[PDB]
Amino acid sequence: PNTGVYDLSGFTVKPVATVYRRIPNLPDCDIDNWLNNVSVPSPLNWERRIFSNCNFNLSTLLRLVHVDSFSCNNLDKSKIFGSCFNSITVDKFAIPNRR
Amino acid sequence: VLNRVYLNTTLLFTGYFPKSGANFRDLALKGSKYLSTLWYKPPFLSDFNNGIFSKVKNTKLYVNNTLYSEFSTIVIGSVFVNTSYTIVVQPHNGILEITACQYTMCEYPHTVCKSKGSIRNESWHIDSSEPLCLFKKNFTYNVSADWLYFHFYQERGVFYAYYADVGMPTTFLFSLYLGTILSHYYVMPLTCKAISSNTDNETLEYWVTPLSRRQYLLNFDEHGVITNAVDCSSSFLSEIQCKTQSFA
Amino acid sequence: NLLYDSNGNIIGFKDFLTNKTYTILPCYSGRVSAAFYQNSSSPALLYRNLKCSYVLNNISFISQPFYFDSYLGCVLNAVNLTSYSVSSCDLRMGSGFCIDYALPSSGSASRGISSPYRFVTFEPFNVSFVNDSVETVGGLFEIQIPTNF
Amino acid sequence: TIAGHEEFIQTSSPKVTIDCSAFVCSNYAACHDLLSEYGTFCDNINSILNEVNDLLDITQLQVANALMQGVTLSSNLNTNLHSDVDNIDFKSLLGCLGSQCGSSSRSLLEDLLFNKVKLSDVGFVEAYNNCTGGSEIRDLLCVQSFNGIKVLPPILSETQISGYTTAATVAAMFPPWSAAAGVPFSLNVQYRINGLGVTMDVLNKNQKLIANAFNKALLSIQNGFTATNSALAKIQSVVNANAQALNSLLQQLFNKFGAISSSLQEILSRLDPPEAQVQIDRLINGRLTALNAYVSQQLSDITLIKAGASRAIEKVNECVKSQSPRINFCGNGNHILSLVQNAPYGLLFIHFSYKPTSFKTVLVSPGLCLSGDRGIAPKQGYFIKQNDSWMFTGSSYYYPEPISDKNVVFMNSCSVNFTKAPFIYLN
Amino acid sequence: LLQQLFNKFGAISSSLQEILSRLDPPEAQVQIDRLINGRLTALNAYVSQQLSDITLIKAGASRAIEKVNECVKSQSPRINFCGNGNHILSLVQNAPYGLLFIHFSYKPTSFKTVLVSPGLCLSGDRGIAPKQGYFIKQNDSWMFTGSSYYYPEPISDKNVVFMNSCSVNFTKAPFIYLN
Ligand SMILES: *[C@@H]1O[C@H](CO)[C@@H](O[C@@H]2O[C@H](CO)[C@@H](O[C@H]3O[C@H](CO[C@H]4O[C@H](CO)[C@@H](O)[C@H](O[C@H]5O[C@H](CO)[C@@H](O)[C@H](O)[C@@H]5O)[C@@H]4O)[C@@H](O)[C@H](O[C@H]4O[C@H](CO)[C@@H](O)[C@H](O)[C@@H]4O)[C@@H]3O)[C@H](O)[C@H]2NC(C)=O)[C@H](O)[C@H]1NC(C)=O
Ligand SMILES: *[C@@H]1O[C@H](CO)[C@@H](O[C@@H]2O[C@H](CO)[C@@H](O)[C@H](O)[C@H]2NC(C)=O)[C@H](O)[C@H]1NC(C)=O
Ligand SMILES: *[C@@H]1O[C@H](CO)[C@@H](O[C@@H]2O[C@H](CO)[C@@H](O)[C@H](O)[C@H]2NC(C)=O)[C@H](O)[C@H]1NC(C)=O
Ligand SMILES: *[C@@H]1O[C@H](CO)[C@@H](O[C@@H]2O[C@H](CO)[C@@H](O)[C@H](O)[C@H]2NC(C)=O)[C@H](O)[C@H]1NC(C)=O
Ligand SMILES: *[C@@H]1O[C@H](CO)[C@@H](O)[C@H](O)[C@H]1NC(C)=O
Ligand SMILES: *[C@@H]1O[C@H](CO)[C@@H](O)[C@H](O)[C@H]1NC(C)=O
Ligand SMILES: *[C@@H]1O[C@H](CO)[C@@H](O)[C@H](O)[C@H]1NC(C)=O
Ligand SMILES: *[C@@H]1O[C@H](CO)[C@@H](O)[C@H](O)[C@H]1NC(C)=O
Ligand SMILES: *[C@@H]1O[C@H](CO)[C@@H](O)[C@H](O)[C@H]1NC(C)=O
Ligand SMILES: *[C@@H]1O[C@H](CO)[C@@H](O)[C@H](O)[C@H]1NC(C)=O
Ligand SMILES: *[C@@H]1O[C@H](CO)[C@@H](O)[C@H](O)[C@H]1NC(C)=O
Ligand SMILES: *[C@@H]1O[C@H](CO)[C@@H](O)[C@H](O)[C@H]1NC(C)=O
Ligand SMILES: *[C@@H]1O[C@H](CO)[C@@H](O)[C@H](O)[C@H]1NC(C)=O
Ligand SMILES: *[C@@H]1O[C@H](CO)[C@@H](O)[C@H](O)[C@H]1NC(C)=O
Ligand SMILES: *[C@@H]1O[C@H](CO)[C@@H](O)[C@H](O)[C@H]1NC(C)=O
Ligand SMILES: *[C@@H]1O[C@H](CO)[C@@H](O)[C@H](O)[C@H]1NC(C)=O
């Protein structure tokens, strides 16, 4: 290359450590107990439960209920695993066969 | 805003706000012995569309040089029968009791001042069987405050309530899932023995204005307190202030 | 518990466990300016507006034997020679400084290792000087007049 | 009397450089992989900005060449001893020149100008020096430079330009007189005032009043940079326009451009690499469009800057270094001379002019018809009648003097409306 | 500008031939639209850059017209416009995309140190100033020389400008009633 002054690609200072903060001793959300409840509503009177200030994980949940299918929208399943949220709202009802 | 602090800056923010330049309505009613049926009519029975902002006067009474706080109670619902839920906000002299239940409401509800009670008895519901409730909670407020401020609104089946007793901007009080749409509110008349002009010259006041979703410009000072606001679509100067994001 | 600015970035927080308050700043980001002469094995480097202690401790940990601080920032792989002046330069760094290249010849075979890059002063214009007086010599002025052209 | 007024001409601007991939993708590996598929988009932006900055460097060298062309000085010149000629004090205009000074200083008028403008060439350097620490907690320039937007210093420092203007000023004061047409300064002032129509007798009688008026005009310029000066507002407009353009470019990083968020950190912590690329592509297109618009605006502003610099070079060559016979080019008419000083991003010219203070109503004639049908016309003046005798006066100062061959131009005929005067066979 | 035809701009390929031999007209249009938008953006950027360069070219052409009118066709009394000072004349030649001007100038080669006076005060309190030159003393006699070549010559009415008074620091010379 020719004689000249060249401005090279930008760098960033690499991080030395990791700060990690969580609240200890929170109860379990127990979402599988609400999903596996004996009383199941219809779509006309579908039910809602709100979960907050608690700990959950998707592995025990997806193994304690008998999953036929699990999909996600505007989100990804692998991004849930270490994340925190303000709340989780769960709605449920039973499905009529032809609908 | 929810859990955020803003420091020495202006902020453009859309929320459930009143319309600047609109009208308050003083819906408070004081009675002594008789109840007029015109009090319970769609002049005073109003529409809850998105929500309301209310400015409430804290009326102070003195018995044996002891302070008593008093103001009107408000009910928010749809049909006010025991097949639906009604939200009742009622003061108890420093305690704000808030319930959401399937009440059997009376045709002519009223409340009674507890410091120097009236001729009538308090009667706004009759339920001898403990009806179903979604929410039941007591909060506290400043008994020496002059004014109280409330935001009540609804969105996507959820009711939200904000309040303030020191200063004008309000803070989050509670939210509650209903799954239905509220349509009406009513400020209940208060029956007292002694509030009028031949007594200590006190008045009840309950000013209500509607809410809608709109954009404001807010000013936060060095301590994070909201000191100034401008509704961006109310005048030409307000349009200039919101396009420059400056109060001067 | 969170402090924001008007653009929506978090700039501070209060800790839930210890009730301690902190402000948050972004880490450093920048680029390097390389002055390169043709047919050389490596360029001279300039980290603008940075001290050399910050460059050696926080940015780069490779071996750099030649470095100094200058008005423009930290200079690597060059000799500080700002007492010397040049009137033309193809590697101009700003604010009156230049990078010159001078390889050691066979007669000037440098046994001690150094850099062939030199950090010098760029001065492109001069005035002409005469050796005359500035005041009157007996009421007359002393001046230079041509005799041939 | 003698009036003075100053004028600022812009010759340069801040040299903005932009790291394109640091502005668009910042840190993120995923954003960078995507940016590469756009090929040669960032290279064209960097090429256009480098061409603009090369144009700025070329114009700065042209101005410095015009200031130093053909000036010869004495090597015995020392500004600590030599700062005053013909009872005119030039001390506030001179920097530090000589063989024992060390050329790292300005004049005090330039010190007054450079202390009211914070973001000069040295102000940018000392502001970027504080970005490792912040020096309060934070600054807008460090936030801009962490996103790849930085102002570079010019190739010549400001003390070098101050030395050039000091050399151009001192070339008009001392016995080479390279900038004062080979004559001393006061004699040059006297000949320029005489060229307006003022007789030399008045100028020989009033040399001390002319020197005092020059000193008063310089002191009035020196105490005039106070919050309503037009040159100061014109200098501050350059810095304010640059700061506004850079802040509006930095504000583009918070537009969503139709995506779910303006933050790459929020997108990359919610979506998968199939779904994230659709959102990142919109941010990439919006930010590249914003950079293209900024680059076009800079390329348009550099042409106005070059036109102003060529005008300043013309004024240095023909109002300071010499005095052209052009009327109304420098100043306003009755213009005597100009001096030049260094200014933030340009030059400050000080123009001196002849200013009448009191007047008189005279009856004049534009020409006389003498016997033999000859004619005379006055040279930059008029014919007047004093004690029923025809005399001459100059057009810019009332001073009756005898009609001679140095006052008139002779004609073998005369015009039809010239005044008859058969008694004139005078000196 | 020619290199822009090999950018993908987010599509699967930069070649229309490869896109149109793999995909259907529903699926191909999504890929072709990205190439169309990228190439139109590149053409807009080139057109803006050309429109900015033409203004610099017009400024240079007006300067060349001024030098043709006032340095080649005539010689203006402007100093430092053409050349550098001591400028004599200019000639013009055609050049690729422009003009080549040749400037000729007077250049001194050797010098001499002289003691000069800028004006003389004659008897009757009269004054004389030299016209583009200086007063010098040769054999204790006042003579004139031109400022650009040393050549002593007698003081006459063609060398001086007369003044009815004289300046305060002019040199006294009561012996002068010369030619
Ligand atoms: C949820 O809310 C609903 C309201 O929407 C509650 O339902 C209400 O329950 C009330 C009981 O507390 C009931 O009040 C009255 O009902 C009695 C039944 O009345 C019928 O049978 C009578 C037989 O004697 C008959 O006379 C009567 O006819 C009268 O009324 C009609 C109009 O409805 C007239 O046309 C007739 O001419 C005649 O006047 C009815 O056919 C009634 O007997 C009661 O009245 C007696 O008791 C009173 C108190 O002791 C006394 O004051 C009165 O004089 C009578 O002696 C009683 O007042 C409401 O009618 C009923 N409303 C509806 C819409 O159903 C419901 O209870 C609540 N649920 C819960 C869990 O709280
Ligand atoms: C399944 O849900 C029902 C609610 O429909 C739960 O029943 C509640 O049980 C508690 C204590 O046993 C009672 O106090 C509530 O009144 C019941 N609710 C109703 C509506 O009657 C039941 O406990 C749930 N099952 C499990 C295993 O938790
Ligand atoms: C909210 O406060 C009110 C008033 O302090 C409470 O109402 C009292 O409840 C007790 C116990 O049931 C009764 O003995 C009193 O007579 C009630 N007072 C009045 C004025 O009604 C109410 O219980 C509180 N609610 C909650 C959820 O704590
Ligand atoms: C941090 O501050 C909070 C106050 O907001 C402290 O919480 C209080 O803790 C005491 C005793 O643990 C309780 O009696 C109070 O009721 C709590 N206040 C609230 C508002 O909950 C907390 O203990 C502090 N933590 C530390 C480590 O100092
Ligand atoms: C007030 O806000 C301004 C920003 O406009 C800031 O510079 C200043 O420091 C703030 N005042 C205090 C006391 O922090
Ligand atoms: C006020 O005082 C009187 C007598 O001191 C007493 O009878 C009355 O009950 C008091 N009021 C209240 C509300 O206790
Ligand atoms: C209020 O209730 C009490 C107790 O039930 C009763 O004695 C009194 O008469 C009632 N008042 C009226 C006005 O009915
Ligand atoms: C709120 O209560 C506190 C004490 O509880 C009191 O000092 C303050 O004055 C009250 N606010 C008002 C507005 O009176
Ligand atoms: C209440 O107002 C009336 C006005 O008629 C006045 O006479 C009375 O003194 C007032 N009482 C008090 C306690 O202010
Ligand atoms: C040095 O650079 C020039 C470029 O003009 C090149 O021609 C020459 O081959 C280079 N020298 C060596 C030894 O490669
Ligand atoms: C570089 O050399 C100059 C003298 O040429 C000296 O003044 C300056 O302090 C030197 N810089 C360093 C960092 O040693
Ligand atoms: C002045 O600059 C010229 C540029 O060519 C150089 O030749 C000359 O030696 C310099 N003189 C001094 C005294 O620095
Ligand atoms: C030239 O300048 C030197 C100063 O170093 C001085 O010593 C010498 O006398 C000067 N020569 C003449 C002829 O003035
Ligand atoms: C001028 O210079 C030329 C060549 O250098 C020489 O031939 C000629 O004699 C010189 N003239 C004078 C007057 O010295
Ligand atoms: C005249 O000359 C003297 C001594 O040379 C000097 O002090 C004075 O300032 C000069 N005056 C003018 C007007 O040049
Ligand atoms: C840089 O920091 C120093 C000390 O922290 C301070 O004195 C100086 O004013 C700062 N300069 C700028 C331009 O902020």
Short mmCIF file of N, CA, C and O and ligand atoms in Angstrom, two decimals, chain B residues 92 95 97 138, ligand 3:
data_model
loop_
_atom_site.label_atom_id
_atom_site.label_comp_id
_atom_site.label_asym_id
_atom_site.label_seq_id
_atom_site.Cartn_x
_atom_site.Cartn_y
_atom_site.Cartn_z
N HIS B 92 -62.28 6.37 56.07
CA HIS B 92 -62.61 6.06 57.46
C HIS B 92 -61.67 6.78 58.42
O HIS B 92 -61.09 6.17 59.31
N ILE B 95 -58.03 6.12 57.19
CA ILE B 95 -57.98 4.84 56.51
C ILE B 95 -58.82 4.94 55.25
O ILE B 95 -59.99 5.35 55.30
N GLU B 97 -60.47 2.65 52.66
CA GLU B 97 -60.88 1.27 52.45
C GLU B 97 -61.36 1.11 51.02
O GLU B 97 -62.24 1.85 50.57
N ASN B 138 -56.91 -2.00 52.72
CA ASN B 138 -56.89 -0.72 53.42
C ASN B 138 -55.56 -0.02 53.19
O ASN B 138 -54.50 -0.64 53.21
C1 LIG F 3 -60.20 -1.46 57.01
O1 LIG F 3 -60.49 -0.53 58.06
C2 LIG F 3 -61.84 -0.58 58.53
C3 LIG F 3 -62.00 0.55 59.53
O2 LIG F 3 -60.84 0.69 60.33
C4 LIG F 3 -62.11 -1.96 59.13
O3 LIG F 3 -63.47 -2.03 59.54
C5 LIG F 3 -63.58 -2.47 60.91
O4 LIG F 3 -63.47 -3.91 61.03
C6 LIG F 3 -63.57 -4.40 62.38
C7 LIG F 3 -63.36 -5.89 62.31
O5 LIG F 3 -64.18 -6.49 61.32
C8 LIG F 3 -64.93 -4.02 62.97
O6 LIG F 3 -64.98 -4.44 64.33
C9 LIG F 3 -65.13 -2.51 62.89
O7 LIG F 3 -66.44 -2.17 63.33
C10 LIG F 3 -64.94 -2.02 61.45
N1 LIG F 3 -65.06 -0.57 61.40
C11 LIG F 3 -65.83 0.06 60.50
C12 LIG F 3 -65.83 1.56 60.58
O8 LIG F 3 -66.48 -0.55 59.66
C13 LIG F 3 -61.83 -3.04 58.09
O9 LIG F 3 -61.95 -4.33 58.68
C14 LIG F 3 -60.42 -2.89 57.51
N2 LIG F 3 -60.21 -3.84 56.44
C15 LIG F 3 -59.16 -4.66 56.39
C16 LIG F 3 -59.10 -5.58 55.20
O10 LIG F 3 -58.30 -4.67 57.25
#
